[PDB]
Design goal:
alpha/beta; YbaK protein; 5-stranded mixed sheet; ProX/PRXD1; YbaK/aa-tRNA-synt-asso_dom_sf; aminoacyl-tRNA deacylase activity; Prolyl-tRNA synthetase associated domain-containing protein 1
Length: 159
């Protein structure tokens, strides 16, 4: 649940900023404080090796699946069934992917776009294991968090 995520962030001394989702007027009042780097999250699986892994890239990143597989593992990477994501990361249709990987210990690798750590954006935004809000936090503290969950990420650059 989200409470466990906030509890582990407080244990790691990571201060965040959460804007609660429920009309362009509310989104305009909340948009003024929301300014940073958003993301699109992919949960992929290798047919051959039968290992699930997680990819987090920028929201506007154009991406080819077979080319991404070629960078890591010929296109053998396919999208993973939502049942797998539900049983592995306790979420479904809510891709709170960096904030929900604290459950999987060694069965899900983490791929992160390099542009989240480089660039002039003060905070990055992800869901806190629910679609009813968005949590924003510093990219370096976010890297500290994802490394504290046992997932040494594999940073790769697209530019």
């Amino acid at each position: 649940l989200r409470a466990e995520l906030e509890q582990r962030l407080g244990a790691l001394a990571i201060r965040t900023e959460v804007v609660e989702h429920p009309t362009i007027e509310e989104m305009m009042p909340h948009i003024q404080h929301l300014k940073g780097a958003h993301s699109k999250n992919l949960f992929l699986k290798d047919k051959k090796k039968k290992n699930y892994w997680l990819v987090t890239v920028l929201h506007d990143r154009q991406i080819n699946l077979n080319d991404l597989g070629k960078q890591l593992g010929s296109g053998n990477l396919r999208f993973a069934d939502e049942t797998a994501m539900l049983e592995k990361l306790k979420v479904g249709q809510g891709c709170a992917t960096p904030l929900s990987l604290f459950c999987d210990d060694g069965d899900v690798k983490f791929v992160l776009d390099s542009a989240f750590l480089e660039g002039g954006h003060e905070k990055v935004y992800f869901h806190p294991m629910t679609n009813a809000a968005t949590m924003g936090l510093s990219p370096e503290d976010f890297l500290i968090f994802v490394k504290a969950t046992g997932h040494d990420p594999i940073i790769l650059n697209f530019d």
